[PDB]
Each structure stands twice: as C-alpha cells, then as structure tokens.
Amino acid sequence: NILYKIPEFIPEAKELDFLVLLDTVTYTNTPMTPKGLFFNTLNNMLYIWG
C-alpha cells in the first residue's frame, strides 16, 4: 500500500519552524532529493532525510 508521495519541490517557510504538510502549500524552485529513512520503534517515529 502507498504511504506517501514525496513532493518534487521543498515548501517555503519564511518564519515557521514546523510545517504540517497538508495538500494546500506553496513550493519553492529548488528540487527535493530524498536520500534515506529511519524508523524508531520505541516511540513510533518516522524520519525521511535528504
């Protein structure tokens, strides 16, 4: 089953530290390059980095 579709461009956050990635956001022009992912099973955390 599909879990997520990583966006092509990273979003913009002028003064925000956390951005809950909804379906209505504004993108920049720099491309997004995902490199890996990490799962923590003690607290059920998922991290995607790149």
Partner: protein, 49 residues
C-alpha cells in the same frame, strides 16, 4: 449526542469561527487526528454534580 473536534483559530475555516459548522475542515481534521495519536481524549464533566 455531542460531537467534538479540535480546531486552531488562526488556520480555521470561516464557519468554525462563528459556530455554524457541521463537518471539520482539513486543518481541523488533520490536527484532531494528530492529537489523537499523541494520546488526547476529551471528556465532559458536569459541574453541579
């Protein structure tokens, strides 16, 4: 029967601010399920008894 969700007054829809809504908006739904994952549940407490 009362139905409860969580909403943020800065990123809410126009209806949820004047108390005329029936269905949660996208921000309210996402915030509600995110706070449900962290273990938040509401309960109603009567005051006189």
């Amino acid at each position: 029967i009362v139905t409860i969700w969580v909403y943020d007054p800065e990123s809410a829809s126009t209806e949820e601010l004047i108390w005329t809504a029936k269905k949660p908006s996208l921000s309210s739904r996402v915030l509600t399920k995110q706070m449900n994952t962290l273990g938040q549940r509401p309960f109603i407490f009567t005051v006189e008894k």
